[PDB]
């Protein structure tokens, strides 16, 4: 299947309670592999998956150097942004950045991304062509110009099309046993009686990886969305995921309903019936 590598960076100012806190995390697909917390004990980039421990000291030093430099740029950004928006130094504000790349089943480049947010909303984003910028508002236009002048898009493009893809492949290879596995969902159906007049059928999918999954209800072979509830896919805590879908049906008509499960680990979709 397809794969991705993503880095997420968050800085929060808290005036009166010291300098800003910075958190950085890195993912391959749905597996976290690195972290940095500016308030944590080590003051280094840390491993969160067994395969990243194959990297030597030069990597850990370089990743630590880059992430600490990122925290410092965010500290500067927070002040710059208060000026741009004419805000006082009394409020707490949030800066967020995300970047990474997607590859297909052939592990070839699909697309890259690099985007920035301020206080929970879009600020500036690199477009899919990796050459041009989307400024969310008038304030962001000032940033667009500076990044155009400093030739940031060119540099980001080289990273996203080269380094990002190459290191993603290296990680997929180094961590093949876990990253390239497909755990098919363990599936079952429950029945709960609301009353004499109706019952709830709940279709479960457990212990699956990757997180991507589709659960659908049908009544007599026809898609059924009314009177259904579908919960957000959630982490089990052991590297696998969980999801359920439920439908409220009239008593005595349970046998008309089927749950359909689609997942990479399944050679063909499953159909469940009470």
């Amino acid at each position: 299947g397809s794969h991705s590598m993503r880095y997420f960076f968050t800085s929060v100012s808290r005036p009166g309670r010291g300098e800003p806190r910075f958190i950085a995390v890195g993912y391959v697909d749905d597996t976290q592999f690195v972290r940095f917390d500016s308030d944590a004990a080590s003051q280094r980039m840390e491993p969160r998956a067994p395969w990243i421990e194959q990297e030597g000291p030069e990597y850990w030093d370089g990743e630590t150097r880059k992430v600490k430099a990122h925290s410092q740029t965010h500290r500067v950004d927070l002040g710059t942004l208060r000026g741009y928006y004419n805000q006082s130094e009394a409020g707490s504000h949030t800066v967020q950045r995300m970047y990474g790349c997607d590859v297909g089943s052939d592990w070839r480049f699909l697309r890259g991304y690099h985007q920035y947010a301020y206080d929970g909303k879009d600020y500036i984003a690199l477009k899919e062509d990796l050459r041009s910028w989307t400024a969310a508002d008038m304030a962001a236009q000032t940033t667009k110009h500076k990044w155009e002048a400093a030739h940031v898009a060119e540099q980001l493009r080289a990273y996203l099309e080269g380094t990002c893809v190459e290191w993603l492949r290296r990680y997929l290879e180094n961590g093949k046993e876990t990253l390239q596995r497909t755990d098919a969902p363990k599936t079952h159906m429950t029945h709960h009686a609301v009353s004499d007049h109706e019952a709830t059928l709940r279709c479960w999918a457990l212990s699956f990886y990757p997180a991507e999954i589709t659960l659908t209800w049908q009544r007599d072979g026809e898609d059924q969305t009314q009177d259904t509830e579908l919960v957000e896919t959630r982490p089990a805590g052991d590297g696998t995921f969980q999801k359920w879908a439920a439908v409220v049906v009239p008593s005595g008509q349970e046998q008309r309903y089927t749950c359909h499960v689609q997942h990479e680990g399944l050679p063909k979709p499953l159909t469940l019936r009470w």
Binding site: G26, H70, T73, V76, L81, Y84, Y116, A150, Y159, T163
Partner: peptide, 12 residues
Amino acid sequence: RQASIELPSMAV
């Protein structure tokens, strides 16, 4: 692996 772009360049 993180991007190796001079971070002061990508200040807002």
